[PDB]
Design a protein around this ligand. Structure first.
Ligand SMILES: CCCCCCCCCCCCCCCCCC(=O)OC[C@H](COP(=O)([O-])OCC(O)COP(=O)([O-])OC[C@@H](COC(=O)CCCCCCCCCCCCCCCCC)OC(=O)CCCCCCCCCCCCCCCCC)OC(=O)CCCCCCCCCCCCCCCCC
Ligand SMILES: CCCCCCCCCCCCCCCCC[C@@H](O)O[C@H](CO[C@H](O)CCCCCCCCCCCCCCC)COP(=O)(O)OCC[N+](C)(C)C
Ligand SMILES: CCCCCCCC/C=C\CCCCCCCC(=O)OC[C@H](COP(=O)(O)OCCN)OC(=O)CCCCCCC/C=C\CCCCCCCC
Ligand SMILES: NC(=O)C1=CN([C@@H]2O[C@H](COP(=O)(O)OP(=O)(O)OC[C@H]3O[C@@H](n4cnc5c(N)ncnc54)[C@H](OP(=O)(O)O)[C@@H]3O)[C@@H](O)[C@H]2O)C=CC1
Ligand code: SF4
Ligand code: SF4
Ligand code: SF4
Ligand SMILES: [Zn+2]
Lengths: 176, 208, 29, 115, 144, 96, 156, 56, 379, 297, 63
């Protein structure tokens, strides 16, 4: 099924021609557009008062990365390198070795935030919910160097944001 | 074939096989092979000399009328004596059908330009020349279209490295943008992902 | 015990959704 | 044997004639390029660079390769004449920022492992 | 009519503690709306809601005038909100951290910090791994 | 459990610290070195050993689907305790 | 004495005037320009901060690089930057402009716009949300407030 | 929307239609930001028998 | 007969003009060439999916859908019904987003600039829909070659219904500002007229065909997913100029509202990705309880699934025209070749013939009516 | 050699050259070229600044990520000097003002600050120090500029015996105060000038850093040709296509450049001095809207 | 219509490769050996061409 968008022929009756002439000479449709703009002037604007008001977000939102840990304080990451393998931008660099207690842990976990595309593939590849994408998005920087995160920065981000991260994961994990 | 398997269409398969045999019968001077894939796509493998005739036929014959050129591109296969294969995708609106025409060339053999058959080919051919180094004869204006001015090489070739050979920066001594040999602070990490234990027995090659 | 629960349309569907062009004629010859 | 399809030239002489035509065109254009881009080089060294870029390919004995090179050089000349290039593209032929590399065995020994 | 709107304006003037508080909030947040107080932050941030406002303007925070070390009477930014109120304020949840608080962990930061870029507290990247190759150490005694 | 270098730098949980002759220390002048204060090895060392009256125990890290993959740990050796390969929690049979 | 007091007050006044009317020119290279446009849309209304929409390059105060910078494009960006009257500030928005992003290992991509121009603010994200870009703009405002040109001149 | 009757009439007459019927600003008619948990059914291959992978 | 170089989304235009008329107009492109097709050969199929978000970055999920359909055809599998319905619903939402952007940017370049704000508020609401379903506002990566990544949250359909029932009035305000305005008509009528045969031979598609009266639409002639289960009309032009194309785009916005209503009412229950763990990753609970699920998760996220060897050309009716992919698999987990066909390529190639014998101020209108985004043109 | 300071790479942007350089006065004319030369081969550069960081913004793209580190300092304090030069193996002094300021006269600029820099660098174990003075610096100069230059050179030698002294003449370049100053005027026939190109001086400093035998030596960086002032100004005005700083600059520009044949120059550092006729157009083209001046050898 | 030229094929000048990446490199043509950790032989079927290993160094920032 199809429709014609512009296939109407104007009436030739004196009345139709006079109406078209009145439109041409008196600018009726221009006045109609002016009235539309006038009506729009008198309705409440859609502006919010940033930063005192914020934009609504979802528990699924992808923001700044963080490394998490178990309630005992032991870190969840066991250096499987699945996030490094899946990263489309090759933004994760991992080095691991046995710990002093024989535990399988990382000695290097770097994320280059200027290569990252914030796709969230790493957190869905993780088998132990170690690397996550947090809710924070206000982390602009004055230099390029501070956007190259090492393991200490990501652990500090986890310790900073764990409350919100845990609440969001509780809200959304039944869809995963 | 339960709900996870793609359903198959035998009527379209038969129709495309019949049209392939029809085309091969009509143009035996240029057609070397005809194929219909399991997802009902018909491709015709031709000799390079028949690019202009075959295409013209498929555009102008009353039983084909493939009036639309959907895409024209090239594929680089270094292991073949003729390195590059040229792929034409054609759409027929009268018969609601699609067809594919393949031919081949190497780094030094020109291919006839098809701008006289399809006006759309022009830029496509430029792109091919830009990315693979295939020259098209009788092209109205063949030149680079995607790469930077004065760029050396053809980046879509398999032996071309991913990051190229030069990188750009701003120099304050000469007060301009300059090109230098590429140096990466982090080398791209090459992954060996292919597993042993072949996946598909239906595509096994003879052990020669 | 628990039954399947996912995002679904309400029973009876949704109300009609207007899409046709509506540019009224104000009216004066 | 080994019959091949021509690009433009049936033998070496036609290819040499096309090479000479392209060289004449570049030699004529060099002063206009120097003036119009406001370059800091002289016409003499511009023509020397043109000659060097021509001599880089002087070992080719295949007419198809030769006239493909001529097609590429004509493309480059068309880019230069129409001022599609910028001053940076023109100046890239001279590598004025790249540090000199020693060809001596001892110097390459001293700097690193690269032969 | 007009009279009701003016009465609402004067009630806005009164609901901020008089002209002093009215001018204070007008010059600090460019807004003079009065909403019901939802919660008090440990750093001094106050949180307000007004469900008669349209979505996006129904929740807001009035920032403290002094966070960890700096004067924030004029210099406020969105990174000063702690994560629990951050969840409430971005409408990721309908429940403020007063009615339901976050789970308590001993490794969670007891003091929130804002963005410290351009500050001696800024993060500086560095390698976290040990040296790979160890060099040979000559003996301290001569041979002859 | 953070330590300090003989120079004055903090030592990370990976044991990293620039030596005295390293120029790279200059990156921290007028700035700070980011170090996480909570060392996971010390924190997991403080957990009590759980006692179970079975030869085989199962661990998933707590929280069900929010933990780690479920693994089974043998407790036949009385010399040592069974340790989870993901969580670090320890289990033992009631000796004596 | 009064000499440092007056230069401090004048420096504060000039900083307030300069950061209260920031006129940007937006280099809308790729998909980050869409979030740039969403920042000018009514919900965020950058114009209410004194930040005009699409200022002319000859009267712009800040350059916003929003999108991938190719090798073919870099000379033009440098030329436009060199045209701008001082004081001028550059804001890098998005992973591509910040360090190359998804196209970092490409033969035709500049691995970060800071190889070409000096950058004042780096805004992370692929893309950053319009709110994140607004946060970066306000951070640039605070940075401008932090500076002291008359006090340095008096002391020198 | 908290607009006076006179302002509503003026904007309606200037626009040429009833604006209060279809407002572009959102209010309490949107869904709540906290929702009950889902259950999320399983697919057809979740049988315990007659489910060999070679047949699917 | 002078020459002008209108250089720096970003486009360089070299034209020869005699007086006011345009004699020749050659576009120079490549200012956004990122080498996407070479980069894709170094990724698994899942790793390559997010590049299609950035190809035509006004219609993300449509490119996602085209790539997913190509990979599905090569894999000989099919998505579950609910995934198909979700795909078509979000494809129509994406068509609404793209058409808003195209029309309002056209008007802003002409000089109107008020409907841009009026409709970008609605664009922000649909960005909210994107974020609630995927966590990202534009670069979503939601539609996968096995279906979709996640099911919808529990209250999303209600909010989509609430939004879609007020959008027709916003379209009506747009038309009141533009459709019958004599200045807009004088800027658009009889500008960039292209005949049907020339449009066919030049490789045009979508509106650039339908404006000239060609009755062609890929969702009607070669339906994919559940499209053959929804009814809608195809707007068709009569004069093949910019004004008819603008009318067609507005009508397609209305028809997208119609399709979205149908999709909302007939959303079925069930799973959202294919129940084949060698292609689609298992659930997290299954991954954390079952041995086969853990193995398949590990292998799918490290190596990726292997695709049987072969080549396909898969095309969809994207909001800008026929968007296609020629995908060549050699049997491994990484594509051997991926050629992206973008309609804006052919449209910009035809810009030269479309602007013959027109004013300089008409080239802007022709560019706006061609609906060009250079991410897909340059790739 | 401290393994972290062993050269690696191909001498490019992301290479490691093994040079840790602290460059005082990097925000001026010669400093930008010196920092660019240092950073294009992958050295680590520490930039002390007293001005606004905005005035140092043009040095940011001169090195790879992390290779350029900006720190605040002031010349009256030795602690800031110490913390700026703590980790460097080479220190370069480019500090100098061509006029007198109410807070810094010539004595502080050319004597006290270089002496403090040299003493603190020697205390911190810096291996190499490079100090810039003037070609015509002598004790009995009528001008306080060159007199303070000579005194500062002596005190730098006293504090750092292994210091390399580089003496240059008027430097002509794109941001200079020789050619631009002579072109902004819009006496002679007895003053002779010997100008040197800026890039030549930068390469000379770099090669002095790289030369192991230039430890305690004193260099004089001069151009190839000596011109009379009148003909030099005539050439400058001709190149610009146009018809033909309180007291110290006038007296310094009216005086003749000394000749010191016994001192090594640019050729001892493997550099061929660029004549002014090749760069005059580059410097003076912005002053517009072939017949080179006579030279005395 | 056919040149009938008799010479060895050489396309070096057309590929845009820098001079020192032609005559200085050494390529290796081989069938890759089976990974001894596994028994599958499917990765020992085709011929590979690979270039000589060059210097790799440590980035001073981030290592
Ligand atoms: C014109 C004379 C001024 C009166 C006026 O403009 O009221 C408009 C009044 C309110 O119209 P509205 O925009 O639909 O009401 C929005 C709510 O009242 C919004 O009400 P609210 O709860 O947000 O209260 C805000 C309150 C206070 O808000 C303020 O203090 C900001 C206004 C400062 C302006 C001085 O508003 C006022 O009292 C100030 C009104 C203007 C004073 C001049 O409308 C009329 O009285 C009709 C006037 C005829 C139109 C021509
Ligand atoms: C008649 C003769 C005229 C001669 C030339 C003079 C030009 C006209 C003078 C009038 C200029 C008005 C300046 C007053 C503006 C101050 C605004 C004040 O409210 O800003 C606050 C304070 O800002 C600064 O701290 C105030 C410094 C301004 C100057 C102070 C006194 C200078 C007066 C000296 C005049 C002498 C001139 C001599 C030379 C002619 C903080 O605002 P801000 O941080 O931005 O925004 C934060 C955003 N929030 C609030 C939404 C969260
Ligand atoms: C509707 C009201 C509008 C009124 C109309 C406009 C009124 C104009 C009022 C002007 C306010 C005072 C302006 C002073 C700031 C000038 C700009 C500035 O900050 O420059 C600082 C500049 C930075 O230079 P350096 O640090 O040495 O080196 C930098 C490069 N390496 O320092 C200076 O040059 C100082 C100049 C002395 C300024 C002190 C007196 C201010 C003049 C008052 C206004 C006179 C006219 C009225
Ligand atoms: N004619 C020439 O150019 C030749 C130069 N001379 C010597 O070469 C050296 C560098 O030359 P040039 O680059 O042209 O000089 P500039 O004037 O361009 O810059 C000198 C540097 O020294 C800094 N500086 C000046 N005064 C002080 C101070 N009181 N405290 C701290 N830093 C200060 C300046 O920084 P800031 O801007 O922050 O004040 C500036 O960065 C100088 O020592 C000069 O004497 C040698 C022969 C002649
Ligand atoms: S979000 Fe995507 S690009 Fe970023 S680190 Fe994770 S997987 Fe890599
Ligand atoms: S963060 Fe997760 S996926 Fe990445 S290495 Fe650690 S455990 Fe594996
Ligand atoms: S930074 Fe990310 S969102 Fe922005 S243009 Fe690049 S790929 Fe798109
Ligand atoms: Zn455990």
């Amino acid at each position: 099924t199809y429709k014609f968008v512009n296939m109407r022929e104007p009436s030739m009756d004196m009345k139709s021609v006079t109406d078209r002439a009145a439109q041409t000479l008196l600018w009726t449709e221009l006045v109609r557009g002016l009235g539309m703009t006038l009506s729009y002037l008198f309705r409440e604007p859609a502006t919010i008062n940033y930063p005192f008001e914020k934009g609504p977000l979802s528990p699924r939102f992808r923001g700044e990365h963080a490394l998490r840990r178990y309630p005992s304080g032991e870190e969840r990451c066991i250096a499987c390198k699945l996030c490094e393998a899946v990263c489309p931008a090759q933004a994760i660099t991992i080095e691991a070795e046995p710990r002093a207690d024989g535990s399988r842990r990382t000695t290097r976990y770097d994320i280059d935030m200027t290569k990252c595309i914030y796709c969230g593939f790493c957190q869905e590849a993780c088998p132990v919910d170690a690397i996550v994408e947090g809710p924070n998005f206000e982390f602009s920087t004055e230099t390029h160097e501070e956007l190259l995160y090492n393991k200490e920065k990501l652990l500090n981000n986890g310790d900073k944001w764990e409350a919100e991260i845990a609440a969001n994961i509780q809200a959304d994990y039944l869809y995963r | 074939t339960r709900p996870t398997i793609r359903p198959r269409n035998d009527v379209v398969h038969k129709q495309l096989s019949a049209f392939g045999q029809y085309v091969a019968e009509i143009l035996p001077k240029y057609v070397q092979q005809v194929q219909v894939s399991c997802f009902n796509e018909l491709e015709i493998f031709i000799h390079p000399d028949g690019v202009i005739p075959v295409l013209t036929f498929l555009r102008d014959h009353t039983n084909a009328q493939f009036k639309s050129l959907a895409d024209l591109t090239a594929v680089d296969v270094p292991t073949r004596q003729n390195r590059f294969e040229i792929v034409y995708n054609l759409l027929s609106l009268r018969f609601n059908s699609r067809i594919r025409v393949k031919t081949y060339t190497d780094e030094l053999t020109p291919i006839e330009s098809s701008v006289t058959v399809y006006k759309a080919a022009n830029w496509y051919e430029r792109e091919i020349w830009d990315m693979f180094g295939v020259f098209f004869a009788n092209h109205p204006d063949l030149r680079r279209i995607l790469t930077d001015y004065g760029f050396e090489g053809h980046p879509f070739r398999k032996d071309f490295p991913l990051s190229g050979y030069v990188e750009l920066r701003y120099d304050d001594e000469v007060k301009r943008v300059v090109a230098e040999p590429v140096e990466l602070a982090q080398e791209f990490r090459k992954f060996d992902l292919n597993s042993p234990w072949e996946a598909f027995p239906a595509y096994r090659q003879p052990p020669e | 015990a628990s039954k399947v629960k996912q995002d679904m349309p309400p029973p009876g569907g949704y109300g009609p959704i207007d899409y046709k062009r509506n540019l009224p004629r104000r009216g004066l010859s | 044997g080994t019959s091949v399809k021509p690009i433009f030239s049936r033998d070496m002489n036609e290819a040499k004639r096309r090479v000479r035509e392209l060289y004449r065109a570049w030699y004529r254009e060099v002063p206009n390029t120097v003036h119009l881009f406001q370059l800091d080089i002289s016409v003499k060294q511009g023509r020397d660079k043109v000659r060097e870029m021509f001599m880089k390919n002087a070992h080719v004995t295949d007419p198809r390769v030769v006239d493909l090179l001529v097609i590429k050089g004509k493309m480059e000349l068309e880019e230069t004449i129409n001022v599609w290039k910028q001053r940076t593209h023109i100046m890239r032929f001279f590598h004025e920022t790249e540090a000199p590399r020693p060809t001596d065995f001892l110097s390459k020994f001293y700097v690193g492992h690269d032969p | 009519e007009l009279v009701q709107v003016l009465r609402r304006g004067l009630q806005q003037v009164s609901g901020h503690g008089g002209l002093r508080g009215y001018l204070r909030v007008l010059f600090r947040a460019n807004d003079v709306r009065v909403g019901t107080l939802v919660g008090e932050d440990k750093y001094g941030n106050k949180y307000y809601e007004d469900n008669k406002q349209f979505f996006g303007r129904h929740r807001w925070v009035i920032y403290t005038t002094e966070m960890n070390g700096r004067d924030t009477f004029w210099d406020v930014d969105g990174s000063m909100v702690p994560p629990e109120w951050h969840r409430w304020l971005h409408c990721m949840t309908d429940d403020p951290p007063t009615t339901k608080p976050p789970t308590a962990r001993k490794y969670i930061w007891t003091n929130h910090k804002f963005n410290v870029s351009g500050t001696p507290q800024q993060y500086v990247p560095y390698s976290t791994t040990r040296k790979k190759i160890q060099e040979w150490v000559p003996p301290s005694t001569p041979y002859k | 459990g953070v330590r300090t270098s003989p120079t004055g730098e903090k030592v990370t949980h990976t044991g990293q610290a620039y030596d005295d002759g390293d120029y790279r220390r200059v990156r921290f002048s007028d700035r700070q070195k980011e170090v996480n204060e909570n060392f996971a090895i010390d924190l997991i060392a403080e957990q009590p050993v759980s006692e179970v009256g079975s030869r085989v125990i199962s661990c998933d890290g707590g929280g069900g689907a929010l933990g780690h993959p479920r693994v089974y740990i043998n407790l036949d050796k009385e010399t040592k305790t069974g340790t989870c390969g993901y969580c670090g929690l320890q289990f033992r049979q009631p000796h004596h | 004495s009064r000499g440092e007091y007056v230069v401090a007050k004048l420096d504060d006044l000039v900083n307030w005037a300069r950061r209260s009317s920031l006129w940007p020119m937006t280099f809308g290279l790729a998909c980050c320009a869409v979030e740039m446009m969403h920042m000018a849309a009514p919900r965020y209304d950058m114009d209410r901060f004194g930040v005009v929409f699409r200022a002319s390059p000859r009267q712009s105060d800040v350059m916003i690089v929003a999108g991938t910078l190719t090798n073919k494009m870099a000379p033009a960006l440098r030329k436009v930057y060199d045209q701008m009257p001082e004081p001028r500030y550059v804001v890098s928005m998005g992973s591509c402009a910040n360090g190359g992003g998804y196209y970092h290992y490409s033969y035709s991509v500049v691995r970060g716009c800071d190889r070409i121009v000096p950058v004042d603010i780096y805004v992370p994200g692929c893309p950053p949300t319009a709110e994140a870009l607004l946060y970066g703009i306000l951070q640039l405002q605070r940075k401008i407030k932090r500076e002291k040109r008359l006090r340095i001149w008096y002391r020198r | 929307a908290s607009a006076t009757r006179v302002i509503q009439l003026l904007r309606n007459w200037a626009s040429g239609r009833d604006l209060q019927a279809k407002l572009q600003l959102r209010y309490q008619e949107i869904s709540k930001r906290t929702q009950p948990p889902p259950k999320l059914p399983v697919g057809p291959s979740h049988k315990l028998s007659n489910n060999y992978y070679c047949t699917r | 007969n002078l020459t002008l170089n209108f250089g720096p989304g970003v486009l360089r235009l070299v034209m020869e003009l005699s007086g006011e008329m345009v004699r020749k107009c050659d576009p120079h492109i490549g200012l956004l060439h990122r080498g996407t097709e070479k980069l894709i050969e170094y990724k698994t199929y899942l790793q390559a999916l997010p590049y299609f978000d950035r190809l035509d970055y006004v219609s993300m999920m449509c490119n996602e859908q085209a790539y997913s359909l190509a990979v599905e055809k090569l894999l000989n599998i099919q998505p579950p019904p609910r995934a198909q319905w979700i795909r078509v619903l979000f494809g129509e939402i994406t068509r609404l987003l793209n058409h808003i952007m195209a029309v309002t940017t056209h008007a802003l370049d002409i000089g109107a600039m008020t409907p841009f704000f009026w409709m970008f508020e609605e664009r922000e609401k649909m960005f909210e829909f994107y974020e609630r379903v995927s966590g990202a506002r534009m670069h979503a990566a939601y539609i996968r070659p096995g279906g979709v990544h996640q099911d919808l949250p529990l209250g999303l359909l209600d909010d989509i219904y609430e939004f879609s029932k007020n959008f027709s009035f916003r379209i009506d305000e747009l038309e009141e500002m533009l459709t019958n305005n004599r200045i807009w008509r004088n800027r658009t009528v009889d500008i960039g007229v292209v005949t049907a045969e020339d449009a066919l031979n030049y490789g045009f598609s979508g509106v650039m065909l339908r404006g000239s009266g060609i009755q062609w639409d890929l969702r009607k002639t070669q339906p994919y997913d559940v499209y053959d289960q929804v009814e809608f009309d195809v707007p068709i032009g009569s004069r093949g100029d910019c004004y008819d194309r603008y009318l067609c785009r507005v009508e397609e916005m209305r028809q997208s509202l119609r399709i979205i209503s149908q999709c909302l009412n007939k959303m079925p229950p069930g799973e959202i990705k294919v129940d084949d763990a060698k292609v689609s990753p298992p659930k997290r609970a299954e991954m954390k309880t079952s041995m086969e699920s853990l193995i398949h998760h590990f292998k799918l996220y490290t190596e990726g699934y292997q695709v049987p060897p072969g080549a396909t050309y898969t095309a969809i009716e994207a909001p800008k025209g026929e968007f296609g992919v020629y995908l060549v698999s050699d049997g491994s987990s990484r594509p051997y070749r991926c050629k992206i066909k973008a309609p804006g390529f052919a449209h910009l190639a035809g810009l030269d013939k479309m602007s013959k014998g027109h004013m300089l101020a008409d080239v802007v209108a022709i560019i706006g009516t061609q609906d060009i985004v250079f991410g897909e043109v340059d790739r | 050699l401290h393994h972290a300071l062993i050269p690696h790479g191909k001498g490019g942007r992301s290479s490691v050259s093994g040079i840790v350089a602290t460059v005082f006065g990097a925000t001026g004319f010669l400093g930008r070229y010196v920092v660019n030369h240092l950073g294009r081969m992958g050295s680590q550069v520490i930039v002390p600044y007293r001005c606004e960081p905005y005035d140092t913004m043009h040095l940011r793209p001169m090195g790879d990520l992390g290779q350029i580190i900006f720190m605040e300092w002031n010349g009256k304090d030795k602690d800031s000097i110490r913390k700026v030069v703590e980790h460097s193996n080479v220190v370069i002094n480019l500090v100098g003002r061509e006029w007198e300021t109410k807070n810094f006269d010539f004595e502080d600029v050319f004597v006290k600050i270089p002496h403090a820099i040299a003493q603190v660098s020697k205390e911190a174990g810096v291996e190499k120090l490079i100090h810039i003075s003037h070609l015509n610096a002598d004790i009995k100069s009528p001008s306080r500029y060159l007199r303070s230059k000579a005194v500062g050179e002596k005190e730098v030698r006293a504090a750092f015996p292994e210091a390399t002294i580089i003496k240059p003449s008027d430097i002509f370049g794109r941001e200079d105060r020789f050619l631009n100053y002579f072109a902004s005027m819009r006496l002679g026939k007895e003053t002779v000038k010997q100008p040197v190109y800026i890039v030549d001086v930068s390469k000379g400093i770099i090669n002095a850093i790289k030369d192991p035998d230039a430890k305690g030596k004193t260099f004089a960086f001069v151009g190839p040709n000596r011109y009379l002032l009148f003909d030099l100004v005539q050439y400058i005005f001709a190149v610009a296509y146009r018809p033909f700083t309180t007291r110290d600059k006038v007296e310094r520009v009216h005086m003749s450049d000394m000749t010191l044949p016994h001192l090594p120059g640019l050729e001892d550092l493997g550099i061929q001095a660029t004549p002014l006729e090749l760069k005059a157009i580059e410097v003076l083209r912005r002053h517009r809207t072939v017949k080179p001046a006579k030279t005395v050898n | 219509q056919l040149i009938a030229v008799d010479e060895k094929l050489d396309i070096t000048t057309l590929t845009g490769v820098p001079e020192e990446h032609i005559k200085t490199r050494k390529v290796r043509i081989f069938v890759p050996a089976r990974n001894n950790m596994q028994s599958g032989v499917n990765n020992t079927k085709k011929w590979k061409m690979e270039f000589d290993t060059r210097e790799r160094w440590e980035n001073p920032l981030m290592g």
